[PDB]
């Protein structure tokens, strides 16, 4: 149920050029996980019942960066600002979603389709919509299913975003990477979740919740067995996340 907007040829050209510049920058600075986190924190505030929040460029505002879940993302916004300045025609909304797509590509992940045309909105959403790492399955369905409108499959596939990056005790309080190879986008998140706790590696309560829910667990097992199936489901879920509230039929 998407009807994407028309954008000018100049807009399209800037998208193409920004994608290239983002690849080089993200690779050089080793910041793919942070850019994926930025894209996710931008989009995951959407509430389908009120049509508020979502990937509309608001995360750059001080009021939204002040949300406690957003500890550390001020760094991401500042890192990208000089590059955004080379592409004045793009919305911030598009630019941050494009950075998220590129972060997955450059770490070896699937090619997530991208459609331009998000408009920047003035008003940030209220604090509190992003999921709590200490809660379990019911909470995950309330946030991704009831608020965002994604499926059970999308929840499990998107949790695999933790295959890259790490938590920090100065940001969330949790500490360490989920995988041995935190700059490579692979299915290691799921093989680690299955094999249990291992000193040096993180599992959040929210990650463990996938192991004991009757619907999530068979999807974990599938993605741990079959990286290609993970990639296909991941790309569909990321595209839906990046488009919440946008171009809805």
Q: Which residues pair with 248 in a beta bridge?
A: 2
Options 15, 26, 36, 106; binder of ligand HEM; rule CB under 6 A: 36
Q: Does 67 carry a binding-site annotation?
A: no
Binding of residue 168 to ligand HEM (CB under 6 A): yes
Do 122 and 201 touch, CB atoms closer than 8 A?
no
Nearer to ligand HEM, 5 or 113 (CB): 113
61 is catalytic: no
181 is an interface residue for Ca ion by CB under 5 A: yes
> Given the rule CB under 5 A, which of 57-65, 119-127, 165-173, 179-187 is the region that contacts Ca ion?
179-187
- CB neighbour list of residue 33: distance below 8 Å, 6 or more residues apart: 103, 164, 165, 166, 182, 183
C-beta closer to ligand HEM: residue 7 or 172: 172
The answer to the question of whether 168 is labelled as a binding residue is: yes
Residue 53 as a binder of ligand HEM (CB under 6 A): the answer is no
**104, two tokens:** 């997955």
* Site for ligand HEM contains 179 (CB under 6 A): no
**What gap in Å lies between CA 198 and CA 181, rounded to an integer?**
14
CB atoms < 10 A from the CB of 242, how many? 26
The whole-angstrom separation of Cα 67 and Cα 79 is: 19
**According to CB under 6 A, which residues from 190 to 249 bind ligand HEM?**
206
SS3 58: helix
Q: Does 176 bind ligand HEM (CB under 6 A)?
A: no
Q: What share of the chain is helix, strand, coil (3-state, %, to 5)?
A: 55, 5, 40
Selected range binding ligand HEM among 7-15, 58-66, 164-172, 184-192, rule: CB under 6 A: 164-172
Which residues contact ligand HEM by CB under 6 A? 33-34, 36-37, 40, 72, 131, 133, 158-159, 161-162, 164-168, 171-172, 174, 206
Active-site residues: which are they? Answer: 41
């Amino acid at each position: 149920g998407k009807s994407y907007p028309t954008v000018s040829a100049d807009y399209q050209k800037a998208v193409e050029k920004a994608k290239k510049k983002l690849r080089g920058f993200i690779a050089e600075k080793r910041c793919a996980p942070l850019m994926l986190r930025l894209a996710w924190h931008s989009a995951g505030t959407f509430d389908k019942g009120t049509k508020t929040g979502g990937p509309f460029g608001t995360i750059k505002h001080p009021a939204e960066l002040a949300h406690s879940a957003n500890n550390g993302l001020d760094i991401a916004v500042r890192l990208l600002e000089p590059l955004k300045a080379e592409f004045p025609i793009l919305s911030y909304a598009d630019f941050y979603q494009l950075a998220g797509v590129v972060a997955v590509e450059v770490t070896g992940g699937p090619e997530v389709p991208f459609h331009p045309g998000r408009e920047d909105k003035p008003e940030p959403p209220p604090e509190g919509r992003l999921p709590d790492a200490t809660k379990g399955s019911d909470h995950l369905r309330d946030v991704f299913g009831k608020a965002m409108g994604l499926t059970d499959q999308d929840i499990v596939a998107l949790s695999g975003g933790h295959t890259i990056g790490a938590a920090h005790k100065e940001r969330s309080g949790f500490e360490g990477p989920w995988t041995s190879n935190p700059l490579i986008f692979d299915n290691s998140y799921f093989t680690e979740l299955l094999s249990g706790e291992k000193e040096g590696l993180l599992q959040l309560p929210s990650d463990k919740a996938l192991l004991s829910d009757p619907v999530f667990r068979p999807l974990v097992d599938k993605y741990a067995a079959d990286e290609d199936a993970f990639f296909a489901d991941y790309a569909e879920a990321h595209q839906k996340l990046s488009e919440l509230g946008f171009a809805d039929a």
